[PDB]
């Protein structure tokens, strides 16, 4: 039978982080083939690694950014291509993603620059590595392209607030939610000409280069007023609804969003990951879950299990790890009514989770529709959750259960599916057979009490 046909503008957004630390040199040429099956499963957006030239050339993951206007197009930092390829290869990849229906998000590093071409003597301060030549800026940041947004100025020390925790003369750090100085040469987003250049750059990335949104690196270290004004400018200068997600790795993420104060900005749900750390232990209390996705800001949450900082060879940030129960964690984020979930390439590819995650991605794409309902019968060992489906799309809706224990065997729970007189089957295949519901919609739904197969996604049988 046919899959549920979701009206195109109601389809769930499912994001794929298309990299991990040091992964995929030469990504751009390989991205079309990587993305084709992901689109089939239900991925609709891809967060691509930072695509601008970094100080370390082809050895740069991209976060040590040198020239935001050099996407692998100019011979700078010892290479023309970035680690991922040339700009032409990136453009080819973007066109391929467009044809697949996948929006691409640009990982923008605004906070600092690295790799100055020369030292300057700053009057009243001393020597600093602040002279940046920026060939991509020379080529693309012009009045011919940008009209009144163009200003004739060089990126020397006056484009920066300071370095190594010291302000340059006349500078201030800006209004930042977290501490302002992180590393490198801190960019002065209180300087009008820098603000205006970045507005032009944002228009370039969306309207000229062809990205569809931004992941904003280290953004709680960046002036909050610039952040708001830049987002609002770019959103209004673009015909489509541009996606923006903040990496605001702070304790009060809701407070950060309240401070930036723009409806266009989402944020990664770092606090929810604490529950996945507990889940991984095999001892989580399954009755309750925190995070931005369980708050008033849940429509602005971008949920995830791990990223290239929280899961990386060597654990450089000294972060509690999510090792076990990862399919259960993915089922939790993927089937939620609210939040945009992220599938991490390291989990999908390196750790080999694709064969099981593919079914959860498909379940989000085709069945996770309609209002969600929490379950009053959760136990310390089992969490359940219902999507009622859409009456206008028969076959939608689901009853999800996840085990946080490794006891073996099955346990069943009487749950209101909101679909009376209906037969359900487990889309994952982890529990065989069927569940029938009564005249009120209630049925007894099993889950396997194991780490390795302890998630079930019961959906209507066509």
Residues 6+ apart with CB under 8 A from 243: 45, 103, 105, 212, 213, 214, 266
The three-class DSSP label of residue 141 is coil
CB atoms within 10 A of CB 120: 16
**Distance (Å, rounded) from C-alpha 100 to C-alpha 220?**
33
Which pair of structure tokens corresponds to residue 305? 């299990």
**What is the architecture, at CATH level 2, of domain 8-268?**
Alpha-Beta Barrel (3.20)
Q: Which residues pair with 426 in a beta bridge?
A: 458
Residues 6+ apart with CB under 8 A from 222: 110, 111, 174, 176, 187, 189, 216
From the DSSP assignment, how many helices (H) and strands (E) are in the chain? 11, 24
| Beta carbons of 108 and 215 less than 8 angstroms apart | yes
| Beta carbons of 258 and 224 less than 8 angstroms apart | no
Resolution reading in Å: 1.3
C-alpha dist (Å) from residue 198 to 129, 149, 186, 192, 372: 22, 9, 15, 10, 40
Which pair of structure tokens corresponds to residue 194? 């820098």
**Distance (Å, rounded) from C-alpha 276 to C-alpha 359?**
20
CATH number of 373-460: 2.60.40.1180
The verdict on whether 269 is a catalytic residue reads no
Domain residues of the chain, as ranges? Answer: 8-268, 373-460
Residue with tokens 């541009």: 242
Pairing relationship of beta strands 455-460 and 398-403 according to DSSP bridges:
antiparallel
Residues 6+ apart with CB under 8 A from 416: 373, 386, 440, 441, 442
**Distance (Å, rounded) from C-alpha 85 to C-alpha 201?**
20
C-alpha dist (Å) from residue 253 to 106, 178, 248: 21, 11, 7
- Taking phi over 0 as left and psi of -120 to 50 as alpha, with beta for the rest, 2 belongs to beta
| Beta carbons of 347 and 439 less than 8 angstroms apart | no
Which pair of structure tokens corresponds to residue 431? 């529990």
CB atoms within 10 A of CB 232: 16
C-alpha dist (Å) from residue 456 to 43, 212, 285, 398, 430: 21, 34, 19, 10, 6
Which pair of structure tokens corresponds to residue 4? 């549920």
Angle between helices 224-236 and 253-260 (to 10 degrees): 60
Burial of 303 (0-12, 13-18, 19+ CB in 10 A): buried
* CA quadruple 113, 119, 121, 125: dihedral, nearest 10: 40
| Options 67, 247, 306, 426, the catalytic residue | 247
* 233 sits in which H/E element: helix 224-236
Taking the CA of residue 452 as centre, how many other CA atoms within 13 Å lie in the half-sphere pointing to its CB?
2
* CA quadruple 314, 317, 319, 324: dihedral, nearest 10: -30
| Options 67, 186, 217, 269, the catalytic residue | 217
Q: Could you give phi then psi for residue 132, rounded to 5 degrees?
A: -115, 125
Cα 271-224-153 angle, rounded to 5 deg: 135
**Distance (Å, rounded) from C-alpha 161 to C-alpha 63?**
19
Ordered DSSP codes for 400-451: EEEE-----SEEEEEEE-S-TT-EEEETTSSS-SEEE--TTSEEEEEEE-ST
The three-class DSSP label of residue 179 is coil
Look at residues 412, 423, 350 and name the one whose alpha carbon lies nearest to residue 381: 412
Helical spans, DSSP H, in 141-191: 143-146
The verdict on whether 247 is a catalytic residue reads yes
**Chain centre distance of CA 442:** 36
Q: Which residues pair with 108 in a beta bridge?
A: 216
Ordered DSSP codes for 41-109: HT--EEEPPP-SEETTGGG--S-SEEETT-SS-S-BTTBSS-SS--HHHHHHHHHHHHHHT-EEEEEE-
C-alpha dist (Å) from residue 164 to 170, 218, 242, 322, 440: 16, 17, 34, 34, 65
C-alpha dist (Å) from residue 114 to 63, 154, 265, 304, 338: 9, 16, 26, 29, 37
| Beta carbons of 395 and 4 less than 8 angstroms apart | yes
| Beta carbons of 267 and 259 less than 8 angstroms apart | no
Alpha-carbon Rg of the chain, whole angstroms?
24
| Distance between start and end Cα atoms, the chain | 7
Burial of 143 (0-12, 13-18, 19+ CB in 10 A): exposed
Pairing relationship of beta strands 398-403 and 118-122 according to DSSP bridges:
unpaired
Which pair of structure tokens corresponds to residue 359? 């079914």
Residues 6+ apart with CB under 8 A from 384: 375, 377, 378, 399, 400, 401, 402, 413, 415, 445, 447
Look at residues 59, 82, 60, 78 and name the one whose alpha carbon lies nearest to residue 70: 82
Look at residues 443, 455, 444, 401 and name the one whose alpha carbon lies nearest to residue 418: 443
Which pair of structure tokens corresponds to residue 152? 């004739």
Look at residues 411, 399, 401, 400 and name the one whose alpha carbon lies nearest to residue 449: 411
């Amino acid at each position: 039978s046919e899959l549920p046909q979701i009206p195109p503008q109601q389809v769930n957004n499912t994001m794929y982080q298309a990299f991990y630390w040091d992964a995929y040199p030469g990504l751009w040429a390989n991205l079309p083939a990587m993305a084709a099956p992901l689109a089939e499963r239900g991925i609709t957006s891809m967060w691509l690694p930072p695509a601008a030239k970094g100080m370390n050339g082809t050895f740069s993951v991209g976060y040590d950014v040198y020239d935001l206007w050099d996407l692998g197009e100019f011979n700078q930092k010892g290479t023309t291509a970035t680690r991922y390829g040339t700009r032409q290869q990136l453009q080819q990849a973007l066109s391929a993603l467009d044809q697949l229906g996948i929006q691409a998000y640009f990982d923008v590093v605004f906070n600092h620059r690295m790799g100055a071409d020369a030292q300057e003597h700053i009057p009243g301060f001393g020597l600093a590595w602040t002279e940046y030549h920026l060939q991509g800026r020379q080529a693309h940041y012009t009045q011919q392209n940008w009209g009144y947004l163009w200003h004739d100025f060089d990126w020397n020390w006056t484009a920066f607030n300071g370095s190594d925790n010291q302000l340059y003369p006349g500078k201030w750090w800006g209004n930042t939610f977290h501490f302002p100085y992180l590393m490198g040469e801190d960019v002065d987003y209180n300087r009008f000409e820098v603000q205006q250049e970045m507005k032009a750059w944002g228009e370039w990335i969306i309207n000229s280069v062809g990205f569809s949104g931004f992941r904003m690196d280290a953004i709680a270290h960046v002036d909050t007023d610039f952040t708001r004004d830049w987002i609002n400018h770019v959103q209004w200068a673009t015909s489509e609804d541009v996606f923006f997600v903040a990496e605001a790795w702070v304790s009060d993420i809701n407070g950060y969003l309240d401070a930036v104060n723009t409806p266009h900005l989402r944020a990664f749900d770092f606090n929810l990951r604490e529950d996945f750390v507990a889940l991984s232990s095999g001892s989580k209390d399954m009755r309750w879950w925190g995070g931005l996705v369980n708050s008033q800001h849940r429509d602005r949450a971008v949920t995830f299990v791990d990223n290239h900082d929280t899961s990386r060879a060597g654990n450089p940030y000294g972060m509690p790890q999510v090792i076990n129960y990862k399919n259960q964690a993915y089922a939790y984020i993927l089937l939620r009514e609210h939040g945009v979930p992220t599938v991490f390439a390291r989990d999908y590819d390196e750790f080999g989770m694709a064969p099981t995650l593919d079914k959860l991605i498909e379940a989000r794409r085709y069945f996770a529709y309609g209002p969600g309902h929490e379950y009053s019968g959760n136990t310390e060992a089992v969490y359940a959750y219902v999507r009622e489906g859409l009456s206008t799309v028969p076959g939608t809706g689901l009853v999800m259960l996840i085990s946080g224990r490794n006891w073996g065997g099955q346990q069943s729970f009487t749950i209101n599916s909101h679909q009376p007189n209906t037969t359900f089957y487990d889309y994952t295949g982890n529990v065989s057979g069927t569940v029938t519901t009564n005249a009120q919609g209630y049925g007894s739904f099993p889950v396997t009490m194991t780490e390795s197969t302890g998630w079930s996604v019961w959906v209507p049988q066509s």
